Amino acid sequence: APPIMGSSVYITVELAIAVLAILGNVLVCWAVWLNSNLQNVTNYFVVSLAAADILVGVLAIPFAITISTGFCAACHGCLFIACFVLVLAQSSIFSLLAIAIDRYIAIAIPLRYNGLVTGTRAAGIIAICWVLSFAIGLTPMLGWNNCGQPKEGKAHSQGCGEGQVACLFEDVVPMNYMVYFNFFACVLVPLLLMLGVYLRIFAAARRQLADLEDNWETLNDNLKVIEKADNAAQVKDALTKMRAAALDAQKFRHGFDILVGQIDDALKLANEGKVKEAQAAAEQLKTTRNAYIQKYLERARSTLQKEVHAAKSAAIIAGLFALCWLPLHIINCFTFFCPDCSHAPLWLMYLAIVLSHTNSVVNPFIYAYRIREFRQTFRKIIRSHVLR
Numbered sequence: 001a002p003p004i005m006g007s008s009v010y011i012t013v014e015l016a017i018a019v020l021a022i023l024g025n026v027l028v029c030w031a032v033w034l035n036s037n038l039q040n041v042t043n044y045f046v047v048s049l050a051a052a053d054i055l056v057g058v059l060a061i062p063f064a065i066t067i068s069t070g071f072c073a074a075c076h077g078c079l080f081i082a083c084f085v086l087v088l089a090q091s092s093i094f095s096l097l098a099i100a101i102d103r104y105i106a107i108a109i110p111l112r113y114n115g116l117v118t119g120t121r122a123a124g125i126i127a128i129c130w131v132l133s134f135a136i137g138l139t140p141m142l143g144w145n146n147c148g149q150p151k152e153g154k155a156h157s158q159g160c161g162e163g164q165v166a167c168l169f170e171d172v173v174p175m176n177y178m179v180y181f182n183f184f185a186c187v188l189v190p191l192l193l194m195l196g197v198y199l200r201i202f203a204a205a206r207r208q209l210a211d212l213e214d215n216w217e218t219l220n221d222n223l224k225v226i227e228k229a230d231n232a233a234q235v236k237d238a239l240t241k242m243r244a245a246a247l248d249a250q251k252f253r254h255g256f257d258i259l260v261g262q263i264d265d266a267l268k269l270a271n272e273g274k275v276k277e278a279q280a281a282a283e284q285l286k287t288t289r290n291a292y293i294q295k296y297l298e299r300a301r302s303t304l305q306k307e308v309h310a311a312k313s314a315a316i317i318a319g320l321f322a323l324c325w326l327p328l329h330i331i332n333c334f335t336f337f338c339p340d341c342s343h344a345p346l347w348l349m350y351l352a353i354v355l356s357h358t359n360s361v362v363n364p365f366i367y368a369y370r371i372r373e374f375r376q377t378f379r380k381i382i383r384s385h386v387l388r
C-alpha cells in the first residue's frame with residue numbers, strides 16, 4: 001500500500017487537532033484578559049498552560065508532521081524539530097504542579113494566602129518555569145543524542161547530502177533519555193507529587209468540615225445539659241465546654257461578641273451558686289445561636305464546598321494530562337526494555353502521538369462545564385463578537 005494513503009489520514013487528523021487546540025485556548029486567554037473576576041494568581045498559571053497548548057497547534061504539531069517523512073536534514077536541526085514538544089510538555093507539568101500547590105495553600109492557610117501568593121511573584125515563578133522547560137526538553141542538543149552514529153545506509157537510500165540524516169525521532173533521540181530522564185525523572189515523579197498534594201487537600205478539607213460540625217454538636221449537647229441540670233457544679237462544666245467551642249469555631253464578630261458575653265454572665269451566676277437564674281440565662285443563648293452563629297456555620301460550610309469543587313476541577317485536568325500522555329511513554333518503555341519484542345506497529349505509534357496531542361484540546365471544555373465564571377464569560381464573547 002503506498003505510504004501516502006495512510007500518511008494522509010494521520011496528517012489530516014493532526015491538522016484538525018491543531019485548529020481546535022488554538023481556537024479553544026485562545027478563548028481561555030481572551031476570557032481572562034477581559035473578565036477581571038478571572039484575574040487571580042490561580043488563573044495566570046491557567047494562561048501559562050493555555051499558551052503551551054496554543055504552541056502545540058502552531059509549532060509542535062507541524063513539527064511532528066514533518067519529522068514523520070524522514071526528510072534529509074542536518075542532524076542537530078532534526079533534534080530541535082524532534083525535541084521542542086518536550087519543552088511544551090515540561091512547561092505544562094510545572095503549571096499543573098503550581099496550581100495544585102496554590103489550591104493547597106488556599107485551603108491550608110486561608111489567612112495568609114493573599115500575603116504569601118501575589119501576582120508579581122506568580123509571574124516570576126512562571127518565567128523561571130519556562131526557562132527550566134527549555135533546559136530539560138532540549139538537553140539532547142547538548143550532546144546526549146545519536147548524531148554521532150548516523151544511519152548512513154538510510155541516508156544514502158533517501159539520497160541525503162553529505163552531513164545530512166534521515167530525520168526520524170527514534171534515530172536521533174536516544175531511548176535512555178526518554179525512559180530514564182524524561183519519563184521517570186521529569187514526568188512521572190512530578191505526577192506522583194501532584195497525587196500526594198491533592199490527597200492532603202481533600203484530607204484537610206474533610207477534616208475542616210468535621211471540626212465545624214463537632215463545635216456545633218458540642219454547643220448544643222452542652223445546652224441540653226444546663227437545661228435539666230441539678231447542681232451549679234455541672235452548669236459550670238456545661239458552660240466551660242461551650243466557651244471553648246465558641247472560640248474554636250471563631251477560627252460575624254457581633255454574633256460571637258454576644259454569645260461569649262452571654263456565656264460569661266451565665267457563668268458568674270453559677271459560680272456564686274445561683275443555679276436557676278444561670279439556667280434560665282442560658283436559654284437566651286438559644287436566641288443568639290439561631291440569629292447569628294448558625295448563619296456563620298452555614299456560610300462557612302458553603303465556602304469549603306466551593307474550594308473543594310475548585311480543587312476537583314484542577315485534579316481532573318492533571319488526571320487527563322496523565323491519561324493522554326502515558327500510552328506513548330509506556331510504548332517507549334517496551335521499545336527500550338524489550339529488544340526481544342517486536343516494535344509497536346506504525347498505526348499504534350500514530351494513535352499514541354495523536355492522543356498526546358489531543359490533551360491540548362480538552363482543558364477549555366473542562367472550564368466551561370465546571371466553572372461558572374468561565375462559562376458565562378465564554379457565552380458573552382461568543383454572542384457579543386462572533387455571532388452578533
Ligand SMILES: CC(C)CCC[C@@H](C)[C@H]1CC[C@H]2[C@@H]3CC=C4C[C@@H](O)CC[C@]4(C)[C@H]3CC[C@]12C
Nearest residue numbers: 059063072073074075076077078079080081164
Ligand atoms: C517565529 C517562528 C515561526 C520561528 C520558527 C523557526 C523554525 C521554523 C526554524 C528554526 C530552526 C529551523 C531548522 C534549523 C536547521 C535545519 C536543518 C536543515 O538541514 C533542514 C531544516 C532545519 C531542520 C530547520 C527547519 C526550520 C526551523 C525549525
Ligand SMILES: CC(C)CCC[C@@H](C)[C@H]1CC[C@H]2[C@@H]3CC=C4C[C@@H](O)CC[C@]4(C)[C@H]3CC[C@]12C
Nearest residue numbers: 188326329330331333334335336337338339341
Ligand atoms: C504509576 C504507573 C503508571 C507507573 C508506570 C508503570 C510502568 C513503568 C510499567 C508498567 C508495565 C511495565 C512493562 C510490562 C512488561 C514489560 C515486558 C518486559 O520484557 C520488559 C519490561 C516491560 C516493558 C515493563 C516495563 C515497565 C512498565 C512499562
Ligand SMILES: CC(C)CCC[C@@H](C)[C@H]1CC[C@H]2[C@@H]3CC=C4C[C@@H](O)CC[C@]4(C)[C@H]3CC[C@]12C
Nearest residue numbers: 323326327328330331334341342343344345348
Ligand atoms: C496509559 C494507559 C491507558 C495504558 C494503555 C495501554 C497501552 C499503553 C499498552 C497496552 C498493550 C500494550 C502493547 C502490548 C504488547 C505489545 C507488543 C510488543 O511487541 C510491542 C509493544 C506492544 C504493542 C505494547 C504497547 C503498549 C500497549 C498498547
Ligand SMILES: CCn1c(=O)c2c(nc(/C=C/c3ccc(OC)c(O)c3)n2C)n(CC)c1=O
Nearest residue numbers: 064067082085169170178328332343346349353
Ligand atoms: C513525546 C515524545 N515523542 C516520542 O517519544 C516519539 C515521537 N515519535 C516517536 C516514534 C516515531 C516512529 C517510530 C518508529 C518508526 O518506524 C519504525 C517510525 O516511522 C516513527 N516517538 C517514540 N514523537 C512524535 C514527534 C514524540 O513527540
Ligand SMILES: CCCCCCCC/C=C\CCCCCCCC(=O)O
Nearest residue numbers: 018019057058062065066069070071
Ligand atoms: C495551524 C496549522 C498550520 C499548518 C501549516 C503547516 C503544516 C505543514 C507542515 C509541514 C510540511 C511538510 C514538510 C515536509 C518537507 C518535505 C518532505 C520531503 O521532501 O520528503
Ligand code: NA
Nearest residue numbers: 052053092360
Ligand atoms: Na498542555
